[PDB]
Amino acid sequence: KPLVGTGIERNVAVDSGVTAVAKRGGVIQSVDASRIVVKVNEEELIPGEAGIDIYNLTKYTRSNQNTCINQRPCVMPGEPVARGDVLADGPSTDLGELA
Amino acid sequence: SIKAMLELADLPASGQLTLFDGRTGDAFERPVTVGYMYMLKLNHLVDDKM
Amino acid sequence: LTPEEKLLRAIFGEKASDVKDTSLRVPNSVAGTVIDVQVFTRDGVEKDKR
Amino acid sequence: EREEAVVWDILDEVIREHPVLLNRAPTLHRLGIQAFEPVLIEGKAIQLHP
Amino acid sequence: SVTEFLKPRLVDIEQISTTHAKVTLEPLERGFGHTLGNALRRILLSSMPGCAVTEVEIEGVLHEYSTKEGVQEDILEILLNLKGLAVRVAEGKDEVFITLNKSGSGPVVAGDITHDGDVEIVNPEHVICHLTSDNAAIAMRIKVERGRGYVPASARIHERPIGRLLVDATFSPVDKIAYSVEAARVEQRTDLDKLVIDMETNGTLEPEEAIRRAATILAEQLDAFVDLRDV
Amino acid sequence: SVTEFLKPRLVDIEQISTTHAKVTLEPLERGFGHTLGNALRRILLSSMPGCAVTEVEIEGVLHEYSTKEGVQEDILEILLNLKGLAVRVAEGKDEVFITLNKSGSGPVVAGDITHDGDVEIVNPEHVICHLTSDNAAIAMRIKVERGRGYVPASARIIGRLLVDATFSPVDKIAYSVEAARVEQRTDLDKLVIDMETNGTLEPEEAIRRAATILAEQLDAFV
Amino acid sequence: ARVTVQDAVEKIGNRFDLVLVAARRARQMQSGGKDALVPEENDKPTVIALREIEEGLITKDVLDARERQEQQEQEAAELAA
Amino acid sequence: PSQDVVLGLYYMTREKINAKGEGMYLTGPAEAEKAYRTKTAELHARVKVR
Numbered sequence: 001k002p003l004v005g006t007g008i009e010r011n012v013a014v015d016s017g018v019t020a021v022a023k024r025g026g027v028i029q030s031v032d033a034s035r036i037v038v039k040v041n042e043e044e045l046i047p048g049e050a051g052i053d054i055y056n057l058t059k060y061t062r063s064n065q066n067t068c069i070n071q072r073p074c075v076m077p078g079e080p081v082a083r084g085d086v087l088a089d090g091p092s093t094d095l096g097e098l099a
Numbered sequence: 100s101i102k103a104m105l106e107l108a109d110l111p112a113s114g115q116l117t118l119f120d121g122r123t124g125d126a127f128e129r130p131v132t133v134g135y136m137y138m139l140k141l142n143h144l145v146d147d148k149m
Numbered sequence: 150l151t152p153e154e155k156l157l158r159a160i161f162g163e164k165a166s167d168v169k170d171t172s173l174r175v176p177n178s179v180a181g182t183v184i185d186v187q188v189f190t191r192d193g194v195e196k197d198k199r
Numbered sequence: 200e201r202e203e204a205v206v207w208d209i210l211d212e213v214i215r216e217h218p219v220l221l222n223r224a225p226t227l228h229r230l231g232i233q234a235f236e237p238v239l240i241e242g243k244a245i246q247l248h249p
Numbered sequence: 250s251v252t253e254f255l256k257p258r259l260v261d262i263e264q265i266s267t268t269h270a271k272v273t274l275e276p277l278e279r280g281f282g283h284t285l286g287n288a289l290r291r292i293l294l295s296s297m298p299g300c301a302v303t304e305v306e307i308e309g310v311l312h313e314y315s316t317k318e319g320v321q322e323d324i325l326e327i328l329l330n331l332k333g334l335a336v337r338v339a340e341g342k343d344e345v346f347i348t349l350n351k352s353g354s355g356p357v358v359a360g361d362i363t364h365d366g367d368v369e370i371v372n373p374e375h376v377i378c379h380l381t382s383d384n385a386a387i388a389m390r391i392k393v394e395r396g397r398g399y400v401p402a403s404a405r406i407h408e409r410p411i412g413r414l415l416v417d418a419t420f421s422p423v424d425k426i427a428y429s430v431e432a433a434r435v436e437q438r439t440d441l442d443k444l445v446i447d448m449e450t451n452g453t454l455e456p457e458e459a460i461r462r463a464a465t466i467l468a469e470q471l472d473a474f475v476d477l478r479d480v
Numbered sequence: 481s482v483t484e485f486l487k488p489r490l491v492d493i494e495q496i497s498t499t500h501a502k503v504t505l506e507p508l509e510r511g512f513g514h515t516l517g518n519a520l521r522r523i524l525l526s527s528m529p530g531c532a533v534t535e536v537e538i539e540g541v542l543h544e545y546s547t548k549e550g551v552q553e554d555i556l557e558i559l560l561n562l563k564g565l566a567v568r569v570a571e572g573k574d575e576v577f578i579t580l581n582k583s584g585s586g587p588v589v590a591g592d593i594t595h596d597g598d599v600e601i602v603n604p605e606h607v608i609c610h611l612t613s614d615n616a617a618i619a620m621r622i623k624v625e626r627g628r629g630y631v632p633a634s635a636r637i638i639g640r641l642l643v644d645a646t647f648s649p650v651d652k653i654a655y656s657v658e659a660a661r662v663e664q665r666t667d668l669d670k671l672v673i674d675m676e677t678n679g680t681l682e683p684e685e686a687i688r689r690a691a692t693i694l695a696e697q698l699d700a701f702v
Numbered sequence: 703a704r705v706t707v708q709d710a711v712e713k714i715g716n717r718f719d720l721v722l723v724a725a726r727r728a729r730q731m732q733s734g735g736k737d738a739l740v741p742e743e744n745d746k747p748t749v750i751a752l753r754e755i756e757e758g759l760i761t762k763d764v765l766d767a768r769e770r771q772e773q774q775e776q777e778a779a780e781l782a783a
Numbered sequence: 784p785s786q787d788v789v790l791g792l793y794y795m796t797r798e799k800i801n802a803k804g805e806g807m808y809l810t811g812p813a814e815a816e817k818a819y820r821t822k823t824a825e826l827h828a829r830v831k832v833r
Binding site: 180183184 | 313315403
Binding site: 250251252254256257258259278279280281283284285287288291292295296298395396397420460461462463464465466467468469470471472473474475476477478479480 | 482483485487488489490491492493503505508509510511512514515516518519520522523526527529574626627628629684687688690691692693694695696697698699700701702
């Protein structure tokens, strides 16, 4: 993270799409370097749905400028998450802040 | 506000510290602005330009 | 073949030039690890073991 | 191609008194191209006198 | 008198922590404290031996740019964490192999490494990776080498089986050195002076022994001047 | 091995004069050139033992700012000239008095100083002052001690005037650290010391004594 | 080794004429079997020619003179045959 | 010269009032350097030099 910033880094990191943002809130069921499985909360279930959310992370993918695109998890097993929370930090991102 | 922050961290209010030359051990004649700056590595690498 | 090349081939009977080596080689001053290989084969062409 | 040490010694002997031309674009005046004596350095960037 | 100096002696080690210590040299004449302090700081910060991780072999891993099921961290992050492993190797051995085997959810720390008694781990609480599943299992073979300075993986002279991951090694155990030269009360004179050297290390190398190796290096390089002649 | 370090293999000593030398040592490990050069410079400039003029008595002169008739140079210039007087004192003596008496016209040199045989003047041709009038006479009582380094008159603050004491025989030391290479290791260090002494000792001997002092200072740890 | 081609231009007068004379001398010492008139001191032919010009041993006059001398000698030798 | 060289030559050739070593008499540039390295006199001390 930048020690001195402007507060806009979160907006850029979230809106760029490089990070994995939770679509629905809940509790993280499983975390692995390439996969996040989230147990959706009881209040946000579509009737007749599985009740889980799966986020497959991009690992070491070539970019247009021959750089590395890598998504690293920033959540642990059992951590509550709400909608819009950052689950995995993409390239040049630290805990949802542009880095 | 910056000066108050520096005083909280027990640092000089001017942001300048007394530094010593590592090659001789002699203190520089004037205080030097020492701090932390956010530096970037641009996509202009000598490997791709040599 | 030039006459000297013919004499060299006659002296040492090594002559294997049915096919020419045009292989994919790593660019110079580039050192790295192979992390992915993708093979695309046309429909109707035998797929190699890889 | 194999970069042996004797090759490095040969290169050092070659460029001993061999001038080399340094040019920066744009060459507005004739001072933009000059002759220097090369000194081998470990790196990929040309070292220039201030 | 004037032509005879007072030889400094080692008088105190203050071990504030396992990675921080203070060593006091006394007595030192005028000007000699600064000279000795700067020389010892430059020698200690650059030219002292140590033990570092050089090669890692993880089962089921072909390259660093990959992931292992059940492990939150990538292999590159695991290697970076292993770079900070403080290992003390008994004398006479320049090459040791230590294994790390673990199954079950939880952090994997340096205290979980099996060693043959000739290797001591100074920071057992150092975190290497996290296992996020009960079925997750990790099995690594780590190579510890004795060396001096910074030897990157590329600079190592070149068969190597696929799976052996090369790790940049920073063999120097000394991290920070700060020297302060203060007044010392000796007999009746007020000109003698005292050197205090604060050493922040990884805990692998003792303070007194480090000072002795630094002094040995300084004297051994000074021997050329002591015997100045055309060579 | 981890305890094996590069030692100087090419040592070149080039003597411009009997008091001026250039010593080149190559190769040295990275960063050792600055360490050795700075340590030797500090010891040679502020810690070498030697003998020098410290205190001077001149008849009829009370303060350093006083004016004396018959001497073209002022008192401070006389003290400055007396600072650059290379003097050797026999071992076992830490304080010796010499005297200089001269009446006439012309330059008075260091060869006119009468000593007790335990004092050797390296440069008899050094000028102390100049006498202008034939009726002018100068009487001086010079004190020489044995000390270390360069102690000025201000640091030591009847009719006694103090002279800056240049005990160390070294007059100028400058060290340059350049790059040297063995095999493909291009990061090694080469140390060049340009040194000028006052004539008391040859530059090589002074470097040897400084190195000996530094080495003996570390005996308790090696 | 040498730097700062001053003495050579003082002895010659014109930098271009000096360059031509030094080039001829260097070609003689490199392609031909001619030997240097000064200690080589591990120097390239251009540097040796420049040093010779600085010492005054080599000028255009000398080069042309000895070249005409070699033509005369070779003509006489071919007559001798 | 420009930038750092000019700044250094300016700083070394400046004059300061009541500096350490003021009024001292020096035999020449060598003794001035010796005084500077021994911390006897500052770079900006007014002295008389032969």
